[PDB]
Design a protein around this motif. Structure first.
Motif, mmCIF file in Angstrom:
data_model
loop_
_atom_site.group_PDB
_atom_site.id
_atom_site.type_symbol
_atom_site.label_atom_id
_atom_site.label_comp_id
_atom_site.label_asym_id
_atom_site.label_seq_id
_atom_site.Cartn_x
_atom_site.Cartn_y
_atom_site.Cartn_z
ATOM 1 N N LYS A 69 2.794 -5.099 8.816
ATOM 2 C CA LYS A 69 2.629 -3.391 8.386
ATOM 3 C C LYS A 69 3.588 -3.299 9.727
ATOM 4 O O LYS A 69 3.984 -4.292 10.465
ATOM 5 N N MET A 121 0.542 -1.273 -0.242
ATOM 6 C CA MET A 121 -0.016 0.078 -0.048
ATOM 7 C C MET A 121 0.833 1.787 -0.291
ATOM 8 O O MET A 121 1.804 1.664 0.097
ATOM 9 N N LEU A 149 -10.733 -3.377 17.749
ATOM 10 C CA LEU A 149 -11.358 -4.264 17.108
ATOM 11 C C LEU A 149 -11.913 -5.491 18.300
ATOM 12 O O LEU A 149 -13.385 -5.818 17.814
ATOM 13 N N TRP A 189 0.624 -6.323 1.346
ATOM 14 C CA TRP A 189 -0.977 -6.622 0.790
ATOM 15 C C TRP A 189 -0.397 -7.831 0.748
ATOM 16 O O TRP A 189 -0.333 -8.602 -0.704
ATOM 17 N N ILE A 204 -2.189 -8.415 5.736
ATOM 18 C CA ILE A 204 -1.510 -7.202 6.201
ATOM 19 C C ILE A 204 -0.631 -7.440 6.453
ATOM 20 O O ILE A 204 -0.262 -7.721 7.739
ATOM 21 N N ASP A 239 -8.762 1.319 10.761
ATOM 22 C CA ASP A 239 -7.630 2.126 11.281
ATOM 23 C C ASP A 239 -7.506 3.090 12.288
ATOM 24 O O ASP A 239 -8.031 4.317 12.367
ATOM 25 N N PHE A 240 -7.728 2.460 13.585
ATOM 26 C CA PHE A 240 -8.237 3.196 14.736
ATOM 27 C C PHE A 240 -7.021 4.121 15.691
ATOM 28 O O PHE A 240 -6.792 3.318 16.745
ATOM 29 N N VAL A 286 -6.817 -9.494 5.714
ATOM 30 C CA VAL A 286 -7.721 -9.078 4.323
ATOM 31 C C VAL A 286 -8.825 -9.713 4.724
ATOM 32 O O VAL A 286 -9.443 -10.523 4.700
ATOM 33 N N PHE A 329 -17.776 -1.427 7.437
ATOM 34 C CA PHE A 329 -17.013 -1.463 8.652
ATOM 35 C C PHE A 329 -16.425 -0.341 8.789
ATOM 36 O O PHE A 329 -15.481 0.147 7.301
HETATM 37 O O1 LIG Z 1 -7.119 -1.796 12.293
HETATM 38 C C1 LIG Z 1 -6.023 -1.243 11.076
HETATM 39 C C2 LIG Z 1 -5.165 -0.558 11.049
HETATM 40 C C3 LIG Z 1 -4.007 0.268 10.404
HETATM 41 C C4 LIG Z 1 -4.189 -0.271 8.834
HETATM 42 C C5 LIG Z 1 -5.855 -0.590 8.688
HETATM 43 C C6 LIG Z 1 -5.781 -0.839 6.908
HETATM 44 C C7 LIG Z 1 -5.022 -0.573 6.302
HETATM 45 C C8 LIG Z 1 -5.243 -0.942 4.588
HETATM 46 C C9 LIG Z 1 -6.088 -1.575 4.797
HETATM 47 C C10 LIG Z 1 -6.645 -2.517 6.134
HETATM 48 C C11 LIG Z 1 -8.194 -3.420 5.407
HETATM 49 C C12 LIG Z 1 -8.409 -4.505 6.497
HETATM 50 C C13 LIG Z 1 -9.547 -4.903 6.065
HETATM 51 O O2 LIG Z 1 -9.885 -5.675 4.622
HETATM 52 C C14 LIG Z 1 -9.281 -4.837 3.944
HETATM 53 C C15 LIG Z 1 -8.259 -3.438 4.286
HETATM 54 N N1 LIG Z 1 -6.981 -1.790 6.653
HETATM 55 C C16 LIG Z 1 -6.545 -1.788 9.417
#
Ligand SMILES: Oc1cccc(-c2cccc(C3CCOCC3)n2)c1
Length: 858
Positions: free
Chosen positions: A617, A590, A629, A598, A615, A749-750, A665, A746
């Motif tokens: 990170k 990303m 979550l 990814w 994913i 990114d919290f 994902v 839904f």
């Molecule tokens: O809980 C978080 C914390 C930081 C980033 C993300 C994040 C970033 C890109 C994509 C996604 C999604 C996840 C669920 O599946 C679709 C992509 N989450 C989630």
């Protein structure tokens, strides 16, 4: 043995700390913990290797049941036999049990293979294809999370008939290889010197010292004399506290804070006054201080391991007796507390019932609670926490009287026991009582509260404690518990204040499960490679274009060492999920700051179900996200237990190391921002931007399917509107809100919660309203869902409060004080009646509607 040496190096590698580092401390407390916990864990392993085959399925593949099943409709099922490409598709009911389905497959096997089979359905379990998940037991098929999920997604369940002999071979393949109360004098210490102190030479040094029992002071704090700033300050002075030696409670902690004055905080250090063997400490103590970011009672009672750089404080605990002094045994405490007086007006009984059912108290109210402590045990046993807070922990006689009552106290509900684990209750007998009441936790409840229970470990005064033994025993009896206990501990080994304790717990765990240790090493090897892959991606992204970096990422992944390390592993996010063949072509990264990876997988055995993504990170701290979550998942459980399914998407999120972690994902999902870009030559291209989400939903859900997707959107929007309001989730925009092709909305990114108002957006109201400007029928139905979801959470307000209270141990910047917990107290309005709180929610909801209308006007 050659194998013990190998196992020792594998544990060292896995936990991220060499076992030699434990021995080097030459610390008897460490040594005793290692020996006692190794024995306890190896006994669990021997009991496991002889389990019956169904008991072994319960250990390795604990049942994933619907929350409504815990404590009609036609369905098609595909069933194959193990080691056979051939399958059978048959119609069963949602009300049928796995046994009927198994009998049905065996009858088909017998006809196709032309034999009158010996095979009884009792000799099999059903595996979910390409998952470490099984369907077994006397539960209708709809009670199983896998079947329920398939029903709502319209997908056909794919199951494999696995025989008892195959499960038993799995069990076998995975085996471990072959008197104080007399001492009336005031407590005092000698503050000798400081070493490696750094401060402004114009200032002066002062040591503040306080005696604590949890958060409460045992006496007033005492300060040292102001002595000129230098790297080696010399006090050599006696600090006398206003508490007799006889009155020091068992869990008394002596806390120090070194600082500079003209206030400049330098460092802090705490220690228990009794050691792990209940001996009152005497002699010299060199205390390696922690840097201050003024007294810190909740801070660890173990010295800073950075002895080379840490400021040190040298103290002397005086020899109070010519022989060693131990805290009195329970028998002596019970003997002293046994004696007491018991006798109030009928009118006063009403005042007591009023306060014990009411939560800060006035002095006279605390005095009546203490006088009436016997009636608390007999007629209000759930008010133990309130009685404990009024107990005078600085008077050994009052403590004996409290402890005498505690030892005949009835077991309390799980909710009460969660509150008792708070740092406010530091007594070891109270801690042991809390664990005794928590033993009735089911594996599903334990799993839900595991994160909080791990945080409680950071408050523990000693290595060997009832909570550690409880967590280890439950982890050794349930592989999914073991998996998450391992990862919660492993992800914090970079934190010096917990690395010793956490390291020792993971070593003990590994002694109890050599096979699982190897399964976890395989996960760590994949994570090591992802970290190196991400490092390459980050650098390549700073120089060339995304297509080139993506082809180079792919080239790197295609290397034999990468293909092998990233393939055939259990997912750290969910051990039931198998990550089989890495699909390099589908892997990417990303564009956000950390360039998260990814990673896509496929599994021929699982079919469409084996198509899973992760994913990776590296660079951001994922602990707050995981907490958020898990709280959203808890809301979903609580709603489902009242028959309310808001179609939430509690996707996996797991920190695995220092600013490292995985996110699950959610396939077939896109961001609101990508959908609202309103790109040309697409199916969703609208006349008005407000039509974009609805046109996107219409393209993914043709004809009659549209109505169900709008309903999925409405329910999840209600669930996330309530979740974000209660949790104070802010910084909400089109790039951190996602929608599934099914219609489910839904959040992602919290980064911010607990306020660091209620939100309604017009684009969303338009979908809810089926694209109509005026549709009060649909809108108010959505309002009904919000209120119902909110009123359900309020009823469990104390569970959220108790869980967040335990989380204060985590060290999350947005969960540091009681001010952060005030947001929860306010959002749930727990001081109010249900009618008043619902009135307050309607005012905040109506306010969000007027705020939404400032966009409707345009
Ligand atoms: O809980 C978080 C914390 C930081 C980033 C993300 C994040 C970033 C890109 C994509 C996604 C999604 C996840 C669920 O599946 C679709 C992509 N989450 C989630």
């Amino acid at each position: 043995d050659r194998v013990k040496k190998l196992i020792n190096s594998q544990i060292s590698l896995l936990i991220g700390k060499g076992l030699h580092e434990f021995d080097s401390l030459r610390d008897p407390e460490v040594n005793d913990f290692r020996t006692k916990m190794r024995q306890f864990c190896e006994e669990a392993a021997a009991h496991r290797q002889q389990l019956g085959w169904v008991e072994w399925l319960q250990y390795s593949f604990p049942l994933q049941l619907e929350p409504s099943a815990r404590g009609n409709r036609a369905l098609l099922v595909n069933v194959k036999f193990e080691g056979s490409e051939e399958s059978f598709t048959f119609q069963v009911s949602t009300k049928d049990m796995p046994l009927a389905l198994m009998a049905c497959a065996l009858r088909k096997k017998a006809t196709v293979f032309r034999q009158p089979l010996v095979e009884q359905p009792e000799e099999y379990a059903l595996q979910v294809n390409g998952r470490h998940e099984y369907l077994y037991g006397n539960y209708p098929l709809c009670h199983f999370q896998y079947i329920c999920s398939c029903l709502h997604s319209g997908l056909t369940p794919h199951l494999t008939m696995v025989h008892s002999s195959s499960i038993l071979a799995m069990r076998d393949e995975q085996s471990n290889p072959a008197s104080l109360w007399s001492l009336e004098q005031p407590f005092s210490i000698e503050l000798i010197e400081g070493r490696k102190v750094n401060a402004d030479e114009r200032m002066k040094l002062v040591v503040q010292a306080g005696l604590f029992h949890g958060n409460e002071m045992l006496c007033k704090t005492v300060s040292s004399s102001e002595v000129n700033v230098c790297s080696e300050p010399v006090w050599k002075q006696r600090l006398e506290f206003d508490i007799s030696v006889c009155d020091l409670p068992r869990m008394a902690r002596l806390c120090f804070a070194l600082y500079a004055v003209v206030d400049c905080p330098i460092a802090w250090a705490n220690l228990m006054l009794f050691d792990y063997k209940d001996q009152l400490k005497t002699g010299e103590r060199c205390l390696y201080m922690w840097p201050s970011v003024l007294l810190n009672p909740a801070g660890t009672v173990r010295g800073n391991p950075n002895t080379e750089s840490a400021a040190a404080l040298v103290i002397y605990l005086p020899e109070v007796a010519p022989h060693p002094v131990y805290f009195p045994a329970l028998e002596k405490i019970l003997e002293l507390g046994r004696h007491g007086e018991r006798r109030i007006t009928e009118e006063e009984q009403l005042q007591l019932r009023e306060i014990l059912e009411r939560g800060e108290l006035y002095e006279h109210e605390k005095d009546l609670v203490w006088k009436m402590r016997h009636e608390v045990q007999e007629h209000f046993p759930e008010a133990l926490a309130r009685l404990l807070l009024v107990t005078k922990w600085n008077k050994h006689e009052d403590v004996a009287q409290m402890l005498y009552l505690l030892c005949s106290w009835p077991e309390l509900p799980v909710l009460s026991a969660l509150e008792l684990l708070d740092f406010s209750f530091p007594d070891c007998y109270v801690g042991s009582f809390a664990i005794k009441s928590l033993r009735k936790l089911t594996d599903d409840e334990l799993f839900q509260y595991l994160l909080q229970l791990v945080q409680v470990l950071k408050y523990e005064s000693y290595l060997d404690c009832e909570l550690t033994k409880f967590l280890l025993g439950r982890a050794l009896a349930n592989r999914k518990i073991g998996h998450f206990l391992f990862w919660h501990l492993r992800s914090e080994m970079h934190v010096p204040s917990v690395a010793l304790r956490f390291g020792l717990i993971m070593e003990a765990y590994c002694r109890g499960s050599t096979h699982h240790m190897k399964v976890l090493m395989k996960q760590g090897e994949a994570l090591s490679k992802l970290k190196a892959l991400n490092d390459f991606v980050k650098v390549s992204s700073q120089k060339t274009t995304k297509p080139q970096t993506k082809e180079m990422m792919h080239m790197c992944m295609r290397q034999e060492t990468y293909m092998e390390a990233l393939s055939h592993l259990q997912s750290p996010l969910d051990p039931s999920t198998l990550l089989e063949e890495v699909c390099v072509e589908q892997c990417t990264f990303m564009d956000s700051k950390m360039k998260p990876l990814w990673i896509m997988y496929s599994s021929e055995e699982a079919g469409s179900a084996g198509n899973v993504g992760i994913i990776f990170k590296n660079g951001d701290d994922l602990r707050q996200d995981m907490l958020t979550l898990q709280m959203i998942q808890l809301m979903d459980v609580l709603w489902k237990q009242e028959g309310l399914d808001l179609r939430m998407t509690p996707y996996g999120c797991l920190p695995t190391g220092d600013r490292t972690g995985l996110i699950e994902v959610v396939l077939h999902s896109d961001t609101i921002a990508n959908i609202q870009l309103n790109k040309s030559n697409m199916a969703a291209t609208a006349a008005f931007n407000k039509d974009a989400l609805l046109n996107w939903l219409k393209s993914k859900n043709p004809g009659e399917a549209l109505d169900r997707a709008i309903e999925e959107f409405t329910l999840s929007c209600a669930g996330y509107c309530v979740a974000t309001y209660v949790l104070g989730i802010g910084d909400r925009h089109s790039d951190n809100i996602m929608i599934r092709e099914s219609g489910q909305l839904f959040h992602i990114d919290f980064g911010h919660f607990l306020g660091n108002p209620f939100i309604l957006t017009y684009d969303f109201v338009h979908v809810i309203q089926q694209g109509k400007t005026n549709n009060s029928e649909k809108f108010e139905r959505f309002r009904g869902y919000c209120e119902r979801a909110y009123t359900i959470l309020r009823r469990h307000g104390l569970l959220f409060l108790h869980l967040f209270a335990l989380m204060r141990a985590a060290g999350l910047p947005e969960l540091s004080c009681s001010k952060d917990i005030q947001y929860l107290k306010d959002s749930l309005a727990l001081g109010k009646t249900e009618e008043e709180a619902l009135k307050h929610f309607r005012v905040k909801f109506n306010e969000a509607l007027r705020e939404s209308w400032k966009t409707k006007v345009n």
